[PDB]
Structure 1
Amino acid sequence: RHGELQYLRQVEHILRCGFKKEDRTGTGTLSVFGMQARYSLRDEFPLLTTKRVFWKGVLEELLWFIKGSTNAKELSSKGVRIWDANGSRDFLDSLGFSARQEGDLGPVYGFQWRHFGAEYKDMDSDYSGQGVDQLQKVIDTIKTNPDDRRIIMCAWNPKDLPLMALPPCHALCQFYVVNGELSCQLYQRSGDMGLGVPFNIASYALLTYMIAHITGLQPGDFVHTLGDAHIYLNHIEPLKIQLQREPRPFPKLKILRKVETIDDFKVEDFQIEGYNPHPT
């Protein structure tokens, strides 16, 4: 009944039934293609508790997407370094982006979310009014037509892929309204169960909370859908131990004032209450 048991059963499923498969560096995983979990957002927030999730990084990363930034340095300056390797001088050069300033990830999530289809130049360019503001369209559609079956934000942009330091793993999400509740489903093409998945779940549940707040709805569910769901071979033992841990009740997420537009959210507007994860 605790929502985290779905994630733990997913990990066990992969350990038991996954097939060996290599990633881009020729390093091994056990993998299963196609999974789905449902995390309730109703009076709790699914920030996993069997291993600590880096919540500060979740929140700052999302605010960074929302501002449309593609500069890794702009997130790093918040003390969140998770995108710094992908914007490093040597990683960019290895992709043939030698003309790029360091930190310049190319047209990744924030850019596609706010400017889909605009012509990417660099991370300093001013993209005001260019391309499709998918995030605002999502919000305005939820307000005016909550039954709509087309409420989609898609970061996957086949035309821009060669410019990206990484194609998005979070390929698209869809929102859904019924009974005054806003739900969201993510299609995640590639999921590292041990490192990334718990952070991605918290990311999209946060987005859902933020959008429900500004559209006057209550959070419903977050539906997590994976493509390549995998575990690195040198995470199997730490995971088998985490798999013995009983999850603690999920924390609550509180938004500390009335906020009117998605662009107006700041770190201080949020507070996670009663988060008690198991130790390292």
Structure 2
Amino acid sequence: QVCDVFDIYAICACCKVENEVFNNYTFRGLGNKGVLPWKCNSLDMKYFCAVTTYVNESKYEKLKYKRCKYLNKKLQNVVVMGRTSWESIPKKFKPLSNRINVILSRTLKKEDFDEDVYIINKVEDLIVLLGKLNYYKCFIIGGSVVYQEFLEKKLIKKIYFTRINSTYECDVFFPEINENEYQIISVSDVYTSNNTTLDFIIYKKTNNDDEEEDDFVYFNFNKEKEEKNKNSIHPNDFQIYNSLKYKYHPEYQYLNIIYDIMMNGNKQSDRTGVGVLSKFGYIMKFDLSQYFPLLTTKKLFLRGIIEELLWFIRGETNGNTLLNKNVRIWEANGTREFLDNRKLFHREVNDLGPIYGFQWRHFGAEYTNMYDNYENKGVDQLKNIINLIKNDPTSRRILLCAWNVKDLDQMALPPCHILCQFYVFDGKLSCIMYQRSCDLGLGVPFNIASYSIFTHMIAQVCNLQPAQFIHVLGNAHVYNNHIDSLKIQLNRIPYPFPTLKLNPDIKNIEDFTISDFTIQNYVHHEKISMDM
């Protein structure tokens, strides 16, 4: 077809516009009062400039040869804009350098601008110009109107589409791309620039020395499988996951582990007597300077997990404090029956024992009951790591450990979050967290969010910028009742990550309150129970 031969791509950027339901169409703001709805965007004008200028000469022959057969017979690219589009560009910037500049304008002639700048009066009269020009690729660089007419006439091979994860005022939008006409094959890394997260996605038209290649196969002569889905999961079902080419979005660090356990997981009956797929040892790294890694492939609520962190920081072991705020994370572990079954016959219901908060603020003190004044009993690790970050940032001993071996049996249950280690470099703070037991379907999503918030909390009260939250999983498992749920999750394409704003006046780890925590521009898919 036309768009395949003359390599007509489209490239854009769309912000959001004034429960919430989100979809691919949420990102559709192009222009306001002539200019872009956002101010500029250093990273986008970088991506745009590098896409529309990049050419591979030593790969043209294939395109001139093939573009000729169709018709019957310094290298550059084409940029097709509208007048309104062409006008809004400042003059300092025109024509767009190292680019063959075309302009759709009924009411303009070639005599009114320089020589190597083309004007065209209608759409089909570009096939003309491409047929008779020397170019690499033809980028449709916009107009609402220029995108609309060019897309609905199937003239577009791919759409290089930027997702600006922030709302602006808008007067012109992108057209509702049809998910049965185009599908996403590529999702880039998420980035901050000019005070917003953005990522880069690629839509493609649906179809309705080479010596050490062999060395590769020899060294692969021992691999275990030859299509027996290792476990009976059926790759077939997640066509969309398997159909993506580049999965650079950080959320795939999570999804790829779900994939890996499903596909290669060891079938096991666990302590619940219930059924898991388990592997051992994974790392995840999230860039807390670029984004806040709250999963987008399903809805996540963070009030509960924030109140639970504030409760840890206060040193509380009192289950009832959380139940009074309807945070029910710990409810099942405070009942007569659960504590009895832990042989804790002498323990008040909702007295969870010397768990996180107590170890954090009192490690080595003799646990009595959940109402004791423990003030100045045992070691305040939390106080200790905050002062080490501040006075000995280069210390390799900044750990916060909740696995007190003496106290485990006293605990409602031994912790899953064994320890945090901190690392300071150039006013930047990173945190490793080791988790001994990882429920990939229900737990780990929340766990990523908690320890990311904590990272910001520590960093802010130490006047450091947050850098990496690093997540080491020990026993990484998927309960069997989650599999049909997680397969739905794998086929959803992640949205750009929100940001977290902390109230910046808070400088004691002890002085935070729920209202000091704001998630910003959280775009998500609909809620799934991992559970029906």
Q: How far 1:179 sits from its partner (Å)?
A: 2.0
- Rg larger in structure: 2
- 2:30 match: none
Q: How far 1:209 sits from its partner (Å)?
A: 0.3
Query: Identity of counterpart residues, as a percentage?
Result: 56
Note if 1:93 corresponds to 2:337: no
- 2:503 match: 256
Q: What pairs with 1:121-136 in structure 2 (closer than 5 Å)?
A: 121-136=368-383
Q: How far 1:25 sits from its partner (Å)?
A: 2.0
| Alpha-carbon distance in 1 for matches of 2:289, 2:386 | 20
Q: Partner amino acid for 1:106?
A: G
Q: Partner amino acid for 1:139?
A: I
Structure 1: 5+ residue stretches without partners: none
Q: Partner amino acid for 1:203?
A: S
Q: How far 1:94 sits from its partner (Å)?
A: 1.7
What is the aligned length?
Answer: 280
Note if 1:52 corresponds to 2:263: no
Match of 2:446 among 193, 199, 202: 199
Match of 1:113, SS state, is: helix
Match of 1:13 among 238, 255, 260: 260
Q: Partner amino acid for 2:370?
A: M
Match of 1:82, SS state, is: coil
Note if 1:227 corresponds to 2:474: yes
- 1:155 match: 402
Match of 1:138 among 345, 367, 385: 385
Note if 1:4 corresponds to 2:254: no
Match of 1:69, SS state, is: coil
CA deviations over 1:210-267 (Å, ceiling 9, x no partner): 0110100111001000100000011101101100111111111001231121110111
CA deviations over 1:94-128 (Å, ceiling 9, x no partner): 22222222100010001101111111011111111
Match of 2:322, SS state, is: helix
- 2:308 match: 61
Match of 1:156, SS state, is: coil
Report the TM-score, using the length of structure 1 for normalisation. Answer: 0.98
Q: How far 1:44 sits from its partner (Å)?
A: 1.8
Q: What pairs with 1:230-249 in structure 2 (closer than 5 Å)?
A: 230-249=477-496
Match of 1:78 among 312, 322, 325: 325
- 1:178 match: 425
| Alpha-carbon distance in 2 for matches of 1:43, 1:226 | 23
Query: Which deviates more, 43-52 or 226-235?
Result: 43-52
Match of 1:217 among 461, 464, 469: 464
- 2:355 match: 108
Q: Partner amino acid for 2:503?
A: L
- 2:525 match: 278
Q: How far 1:41 sits from its partner (Å)?
A: 0.3
Greater relative contact order structure (CA < 8 Å, 6+ sep): 1
Q: Partner amino acid for 1:145?
A: D
Structure 2: 5+ residue stretches without partners: 1-247, 528-532
Match of 2:382, SS state, is: helix
Q: How far 1:155 sits from its partner (Å)?
A: 0.2
Please report the RMSD computed on the Cα atoms of aligned residues, expressed in angstroms: 0.9
Q: How far 1:269 sits from its partner (Å)?
A: 0.9
CA deviations over 1:106-164 (Å, ceiling 9, x no partner): 10001101111111011111111011101111100000111111100000010001101
- 2:242 match: none
Q: Partner amino acid for 1:237?
A: D
| Alpha-carbon distance in 2 for matches of 1:3, 1:47 | 10
| Alpha-carbon distance in 1 for matches of 2:265, 2:460 | 39
